Structure formats: structure tokens, C-alpha cells
Amino acid sequence: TVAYIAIGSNLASPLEQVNAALKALGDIPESHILTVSSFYRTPPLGPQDQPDYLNAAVALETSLAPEELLNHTQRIELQQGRGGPRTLDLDIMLFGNEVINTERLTVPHYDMKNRGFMLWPLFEIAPELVFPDGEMLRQILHTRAFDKLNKW
Ligand SMILES: [Cl-]
Ligand SMILES: [Cl-]
Ligand SMILES: [Cl-]
Ligand SMILES: [Mg+2]
Ligand SMILES: [Mg+2]
Ligand SMILES: [Mg+2]
Description:
Monomer. The chain is of the alpha+beta class. Helix content is 29%, strand content 26%. Strands 1, 2, 3, 4, 5 and 8 form a 6-stranded antiparallel β-sheet that branches. The longest helix has 15 residues.
């Protein structure tokens, strides 16, 4: 089943952690990477001085159940997120065609249609994607205004 996972990091030199998280995703049992997006830059959300955020998206083929995949993403955050919090965020955006509303997991990710830093890398790797409700990703990006984010 093809899962789409968002990756974010707020480090000034995020590549080692991001790359380690990507390697780790590929090494999840019964899973492998399909496609890795470009890495995008987004500005911070508070007034104090801090680095920009890196954001990306990955297509991961997996035979695991969604909650199983969640457990691995949380494991990788703990193992590879050395810098603290926001230094490595892994979020399941979409999982096959499945709609999930459990305790631990909501799929499609509950805010992703509102977040350019999710949708732009996703569109790079899945330009023809259609959401469970029928909305085309391309349409969302052309009807909503989302700043075109630059390459990291
Ligand atoms: Cl690992
Ligand atoms: Cl491990
Ligand atoms: Cl939807
Ligand atoms: Mg593998
Ligand atoms: Mg998260
Ligand atoms: Mg709508």
C-alpha cells in the first residue's frame, strides 16, 4: 500500500537528521521508498530569530497496517530526532485510499489541505493525486493560495 509521509525539521543544518529519517523509513519491515521529494524551505512561525523549516514528502510502499506504520514513524522520530522537538517530525498524510479516525491516528492528516509545506512536496511526487473525498491535489493548489516554497 502506498503511504505518503511528511517530513519536517527546524534545524539550521537539517540534512543529516532528515537523511537518517529517510533511510530509516526505507528500512521499515515490509516497506520500501517509492519516491523522495525535493527539500523545501519555509519560514518560522514565531517572531524570535530561528532557522527556517525544511519540509519534504516521501512515498513509502508498505505491507504494514497503518497503526504499525505510525509506531515505526514514532520510533524513528525518537531515534533520529537528536536535536530535540521540531528537529524531526514525521506525519502520515495519506495511506492508500484508507480513511482512519482512531485515537492515535487520523488519515487523511487532519490539517494537510491547509498546509503548503505538505501539499507542495506531495504534489511534486504525486501530481495526479485525488483525495478520498474526490478533491484533486492539483485543483486544491490552484484554487487556494499557497505560497510557492523554494528549494532548501
Ligand atoms: Cl532504523
Ligand atoms: Cl531500531
Ligand atoms: Cl479527503
Ligand atoms: Mg526496505
Ligand atoms: Mg508530527
Ligand atoms: Mg473541500
